[PDB]
A paper describes a structure:
We were unable to express [name] His6-AscY in E. coli, but were able to solubly co-express [name] with P. luminescens subsp. laumondii His6-[name]. The AscX49–[name] complex was reductively methylated to enable crystallization and diffracted to approximately 2 Å resolution. The asymmetric unit contains two heterodimers related via a tNCS vector (0.000, 0.500, 0.500) with a height of 83% compared with the origin Patterson peak. The two AscX49–LscYmeth dimers in the asymmetric unit are virtually identical and both exhibit the α3 bend in the substrate as described for AscX31–YscY. Notably, the bend occurs at the same residue, Ala106. While the C-terminal end of the α2 helix superimposes well between the two complexes, the N-terminal end is rotated by about 13°, resulting in a shift of about 6.1 Å of His76 at the N-terminal end of the helix. Furthermore, the α3 helix appears to be rotated by about 10° in a similar fashion, with Ala106 being displaced by approximately 5.6 Å. A possible explanation for this shift is the presence of Phe12 in YscY instead of Ala10 in [name], which causes steric conflicts with Met79 in the α2 helix of [name]. An exchange of Phe12 in YscY to Ala10 in [name] and AscY allows the repositioning of [name] helices α2 and α3.
Author numbering:
A (entry chain B): 50 to 63, 67 to 118
B (entry chain A): -1 to 105
Amino acid sequence: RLADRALLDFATPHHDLLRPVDFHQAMQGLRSVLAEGQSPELRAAAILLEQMHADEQLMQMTLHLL
Amino acid sequence: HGMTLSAKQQSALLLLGWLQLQYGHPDRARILLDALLALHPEHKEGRRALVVSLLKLQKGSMAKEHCTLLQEQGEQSAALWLCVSRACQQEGNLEEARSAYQRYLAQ
Ligand SMILES: [Br-]
Ligand SMILES: [Br-]
Ligand SMILES: [Br-]
Ligand SMILES: [Br-]
């Protein structure tokens, strides 16, 4: 459990979406592409982020706090 | 136009997966990160997050192979070997885990 912080830091990317206008354009453009995918990996992800629309406020808050 | 993501759309998807991983949903993160790597397999930031998501899912063998791809992409972060060691410990490869952990401390 001690190494969990260093693993999360490794998974954290080292900003282009700081402006809220750019964030909404990125999300709408992302949902349009995955909805056109036919592979089971793209279809499963298109279902998942459609259920994360209520989490968009938590997303933008995390970006600005880094 | 085309089954592809812009630079900002790739970051958005990476952020969606990283948030799931942060909040202890590695299965949901893996779903979003696999899609990002299906459309842009060269996305290194997406792959590192998938490695950690797989470790949290006790999928050490898969996580180690994704680290191998990072290594040959030019990944030179020392924490890469911490993931390899953790992946080998999940699979019982204790001697390989020690070898990888020595490289983590060397760099
Ligand atoms: Br965009
Ligand atoms: Br395409
Ligand atoms: Br496995
Ligand atoms: Br699996």
